[PDB]
Amino acid sequence: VASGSGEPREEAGALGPAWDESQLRSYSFPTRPIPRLSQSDPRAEELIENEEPVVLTDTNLVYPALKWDLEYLQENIGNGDFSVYSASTHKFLYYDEKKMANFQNFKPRSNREEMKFHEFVEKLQDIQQRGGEERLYLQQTLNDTVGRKIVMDFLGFNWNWINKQQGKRGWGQLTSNLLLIGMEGNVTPAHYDEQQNFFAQIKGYKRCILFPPDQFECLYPYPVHHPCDRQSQVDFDNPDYERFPNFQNVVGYETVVGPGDVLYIPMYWWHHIESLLNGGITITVNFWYKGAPTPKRIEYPLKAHQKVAIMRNIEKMLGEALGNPQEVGPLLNTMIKGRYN
């Protein structure tokens, strides 16, 4: 019942198990499986409408990209610049660079580097070819500069299916598609995003651990003005139960995605994403949409995510009103001690 990602699937044509238990990292909390369903299955429509995650196995969303790999993409993607994140651990914490102004004691552990696709490939290879232990993770928004064969792939994505989704759920516009290409073992630690995400897996296998927005009190996000806004403060490999006691009560939903699977990551749901150990490189492309417009009159009882939005806005307005984000904390405490705690 806490079966996490379940018994690994069998590759077609008796090519054996897709992955095994030992490619997954070990964590302190339990999880139950995300459902894997066909896009024709009305349970899947039901899950998406209710803003619960579902892995869809047959959308054909990025069918033309399943041939993508490093060689094919070097050949075809253009001479635009790609953002490449760097790290000396498997954990790639990310920084909002605009917020770094306001936190001096904030030297960064994952630096961005702009480079050309060929350079990233070279750099990956002189690491492999020399056995160094650094890690890279290309994360770049698909845009104008990409070459023609890639623009044809893109155009062959299943827009008929995803636009009907966008229409049915009343979401806003497609804000972007992020192209992600990681090394085996890379982790994107637990965070939430404020848009709806269809997360289309292309090459390799990723274990995705999701927590509902109602787990906010177990995951201890950073302050909103901090550069790690929206990321959990808890180190999942070494959790500090003294600072984060409710992380002892956290319960997640997990799954392992491979080529052709699309994971719906609903807005505000926490997600922790790991490229399987010793599984080769991973490729994914996501689809971010603004969420449906927020309705005319509030309907009680509020959803968890709207309480999350409320907290964010309190922190943001208070930061503006005090003229300094560093004063948010002291004031919030003055507000609650001996009054609300």
Ligand X SMILES: O=C(O)CNC(=O)C(=O)O
Binding site for ligand X (CB under 6 A): 180, 188, 193, 197, 199, 271, 273, 284, 286
112 lies in the site for its own copies, by CB under 8 A:
no
Q: From ligand X, Fe ion, its own copies, none, which one binds at residue 311 (CB under 5 to 8 Å depending on kind)? A: its own copies
User: CB under 5 to 8 A by kind: which of its own copies, Fe ion, ligand X, none does 87 bind?
Assistant: none
**Of 193, 194, 214, 237, the one binding Fe ion by CB under 5 A:** 193
Q: Do residues 255 and 24 touch, judged by C-beta distance below 8 A?
A: no
Residue 248 marked in a binding site: no
Q: Minimal distance in Å, beta carbon 182 to ligand X? A: 6
Residue 196 among known ligand-binding residues = no
**What is the C-alpha to C-alpha distance for residues 290 and 225, in angstroms, rounded to an integer?**
22
Q: Which amino acid is at 4?
A: G
CA distance 220 to 247: 8
**Least distance (Å) between residue 290 CB and its own copies:** 21
Q: Which does 98 bind (CB under 5 to 8 A by kind): Fe ion, its own copies, ligand X, none?
A: none
222: partner contacted, choices ligand X, its own copies, Fe ion, none (Cβ within 5-8 A by kind): its own copies
* Residue 186, marked binder: no
| Pairing, β 54-56 against β 112-116 | unpaired
Distance between first and last Cα of the chain: 36
Please give the C-alpha separations between residue 293 and each of 78, 192, 196, 288, 316, in angstroms, as whole numbers.
36, 19, 12, 15, 21
Cα gap 300→184, rounded to integer Å: 45
Q: Can residue 311 be called a binding residue for its own copies (CB under 8 A)?
A: yes
Please state the length of the chain: 341
Residue 45 · residue 113 · CB < 8 Å: no
**Interface with its own copies in residues 246-265 (CB under 8 A):** 246
User: Using CA atoms, how far apart are residues 140 and 161, in angstroms rounded to an integer?
Assistant: 24
Q: Which stretch binds its own copies (CB under 8 A): 199-207, 248-256, 277-285, 304-312?
A: 304-312
Strands 270-275 vs 31-33: parallel, antiparallel or unpaired: unpaired
Q: Is 45 left (phi over 0), alpha (psi -120 to 50) or beta?
A: alpha
Tokens 């603004």 correspond to what residue?
290
Q: Please tell me whether 337 is known to bind a ligand.
A: no
Binding-site residue ranges for 2-oxoglutarate:
137, 188, 197, 206, 286
Which residues are part of a known binding site for Fe cation? 191, 193, 271
Q: Which residues are annotated as a binding site?
A: 137, 144, 173-175, 188, 191, 193-195, 197, 206, 230-231, 271, 286, 292, 313
Binding-site residues for substrate, in ranges, read: 144, 173-175, 193-195, 230-231, 292, 313
Which residue ranges make up the site for Fe ion (CB under 5 A)? 193
